[PDB]
Amino acid sequence: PVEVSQLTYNADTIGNWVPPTELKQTYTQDITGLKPNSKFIIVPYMDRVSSEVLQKCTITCNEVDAVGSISYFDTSAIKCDGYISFQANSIGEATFTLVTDYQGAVDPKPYQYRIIRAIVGNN
Ligand SMILES: [Zn+2]
Ligand SMILES: [Zn+2]
Ligand SMILES: [Zn+2]
């Protein structure tokens, strides 16, 4: 276990949200490989060419006690906003619900996320 005076963060876990296959979709994704039972923040980031076709995605977390929402939008009124606080489950995962509303969806590029972990104690 890491002493509190030695607190650091790891903000290098990045990943992609699976793109929808239809213009309107509600679906889930399990993020895996996280330290079991650790507490995290996930935030959106963007490094992504705009579709110009109004690709909206909203994300929440299904884990008990998770709070927050993440918003993406790529066209004019850009959104890369919100965050979720959550705890990985006992198997190192967390499930998210994605609600997508895309005006057009030909080979849609994934929206992107960053996980922030405080490395302290056993977290
Ligand atoms: Zn799994
Ligand atoms: Zn509670
Ligand atoms: Zn294709």
Numbering used by the authors: 4 to 126
Direct quotes from the study:
As for the MrNvPd, three crystal forms (P3221, C2221, and P4332) were determined. Glu270 on turn β1/β2 and Asp355 on turn β7/β8 also coordinate with Zn2+ ions. Similar to PvNVPd, the symmetry of MrNVPd dimers (P3221) also generates a dimer–dimer conformation, but with additional metal ions coordinated in the dimer–dimer interface and with a slightly altered bending angle of ~120°. Three key residues Glu270, Glu341, and Asp355 reveal a negatively charged interface and work together with three Zn2+ ions through hydrogen bonds connecting three turns β1/β2, β6/β7, and β7/β8, respectively. Examination of the intermolecular MrNVPd dimer–dimer interaction reveals that Glu270, Glu341, and Asp355 donate major hydrogen bonds to stabilize this conformation (with the exception of the 311ExD313 motif), suggesting that the negatively charged Asp313 on the MrNVPd monomer might exist as a potential metal-binding site without participating in the MrNVPd dimer–dimer structure.
A major factor that limits the expansion of shrimp cultures is, however, infectious diseases from viruses, such as P. vannamei nodavirus (PvNV) and M. rosenbergii nodavirus (MrNV), which have inflicted heavy economic losses. The Nodaviridae genome comprises two single-stranded positive-sense RNA that encode the capsid protein for viral capsid assembly, the RNA polymerase for RNA replication, and the B2 protein for host RNA interference suppressor. While the shell domains (S-domains) of PvNV and MrNV contain conserved sequences of 62% identity, the protrusion domains (P-domains) and N-arms show low sequence identities of only 17% and 43%, respectively. In this work, we have determined the cryo-EM structures of T = 3 and T = 1 PvNV-LPs at atomic resolution, the crystal structures of the P-domains of PvNV and MrNV (PvNVPd and MrNVPd), and the crystal structure of the S-domain of PvNV (ΔN-ARM-PvNVSd) in the T = 1 subviral particle (SVP).
